[PDB]
Amino acid sequence: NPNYCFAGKTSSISDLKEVPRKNITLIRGLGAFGEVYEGQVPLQVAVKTLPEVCSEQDELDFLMEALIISKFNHQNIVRCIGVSLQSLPRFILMELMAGGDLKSFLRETRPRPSQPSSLAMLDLLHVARDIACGCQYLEENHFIHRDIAARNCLLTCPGPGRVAKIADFGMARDIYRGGCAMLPVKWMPPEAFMEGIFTSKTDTWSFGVLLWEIFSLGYMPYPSKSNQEVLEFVTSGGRMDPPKNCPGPVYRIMTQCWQHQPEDRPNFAIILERIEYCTQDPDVINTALPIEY
Numbered sequence: 001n002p003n004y005c006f007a008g009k010t011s012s013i014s015d016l017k018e019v020p021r022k023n024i025t026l027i028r029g030l031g032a033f034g035e036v037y038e039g040q041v042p043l044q045v046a047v048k049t050l051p052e053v054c055s056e057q058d059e060l061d062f063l064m065e066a067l068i069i070s071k072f073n074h075q076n077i078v079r080c081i082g083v084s085l086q087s088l089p090r091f092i093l094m095e096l097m098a099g100g101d102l103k104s105f106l107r108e109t110r111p112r113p114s115q116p117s118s119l120a121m122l123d124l125l126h127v128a129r130d131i132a133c134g135c136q137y138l139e140e141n142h143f144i145h146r147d148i149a150a151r152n153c154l155l156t157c158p159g160p161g162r163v164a165k166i167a168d169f170g171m172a173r174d175i176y177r178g179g180c181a182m183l184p185v186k187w188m189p190p191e192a193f194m195e196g197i198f199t200s201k202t203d204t205w206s207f208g209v210l211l212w213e214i215f216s217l218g219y220m221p222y223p224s225k226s227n228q229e230v231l232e233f234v235t236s237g238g239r240m241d242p243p244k245n246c247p248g249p250v251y252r253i254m255t256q257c258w259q260h261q262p263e264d265r266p267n268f269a270i271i272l273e274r275i276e277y278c279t280q281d282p283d284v285i286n287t288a289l290p291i292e293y
């Protein structure tokens with residue numbers, strides 16, 4: 001059985017908290033490879049399933065993601081409640097994030113003449129800060145996520161007390177041990193997609209793109225551009241324009257995250273300070289978000 005090392009220590013399948021299957025009830029589906037359910041163990045949970053029709057590599061991938069998430073301990077990384085690996089289909093049990101993924105949330109919660117005040121600049125800044133805090137924890141523990149993006153973040157709830165958390169660690173799992181068309185090239189810095197070089201500054205670039213996703217309210221990055229067009233665009237120095245109504249101080253964080261040389265990009269401590277300073281600036285947080293008609 002394969003081992004996993006994080007923050008100094010090594011763990012194995014034996015270290016995962018096995019929850020007796022009889023104690024697990026599935027309630028409803030929550031919408032690729034394997035299904036997700038709302039469940040109860042009472043403790044409410046999200047259940048990620050491994051299809052019984054899978055390869056040996058699939059099994060090991062499933063095991064590795066369980067190990068990875070179980071070994072993190074931070075408020076902005078989704079918790080793993082445990083696993084049920086001794087029955088089929090196999091389960092990973094996660095903290096239930098009723099807000100759903102960040103991309104879907106932003107698109108369905110965009111200000112509307114029906115809901116003119118569904119979201120404000122401060123809400124977006126708080127989400128950005130939440131994820132940045134999660135990224136800082138990963139960075140200080142020498143973990144490179146490789147796929148920081150809105151689709152991979154979850155929210156505790158739709159309402160005002162919401163907390164955003166990094167949730168999907170599939171890319172990191174894959175690399176820890178595929179194809180060009182599945183690579184998240186629109187979130188990747190030049191040295192990543194060209195040389196396959198990944199560092200903490202990789203996640204900084206991706207976080208810049210996430211920031212754009214957030215302040216665009218859930219648009220796909222590089223509108224109208226294909227993966228290869230983005231690759232050539234970014235390699236040549238091209239960068240995205242500010243999202244609609246984006247305050248200048250916020251856009252400047254994005255452009256710093258997208259510096260061509262990794263050494264010129266901020267670490268997450270600095271990104272956090274700059275997000276904090278934005279939340280303090282009345283001219284930033286008093287800026288109205290566009291209302292979608």
Ligand SMILES: C[C@@H](Oc1cc(-c2cnn(C3CCNCC3)c2)cnc1N)c1c(Cl)ccc(F)c1Cl
Pocket residue numbers: 030031036046048078094095096097098099100101151152153154166167168
């Ligand atoms: C594996 C799966 O886990 C969860 C999904 C969800 C989820 C997905 N969708 N929804 C909706 C349920 C109905 N109300 C709106 C959100 C909740 C909540 N908690 C989870 N732990 C998941 C999904 Cl499905 C998408 C992105 C992620 F980063 C993750 Cl980690």
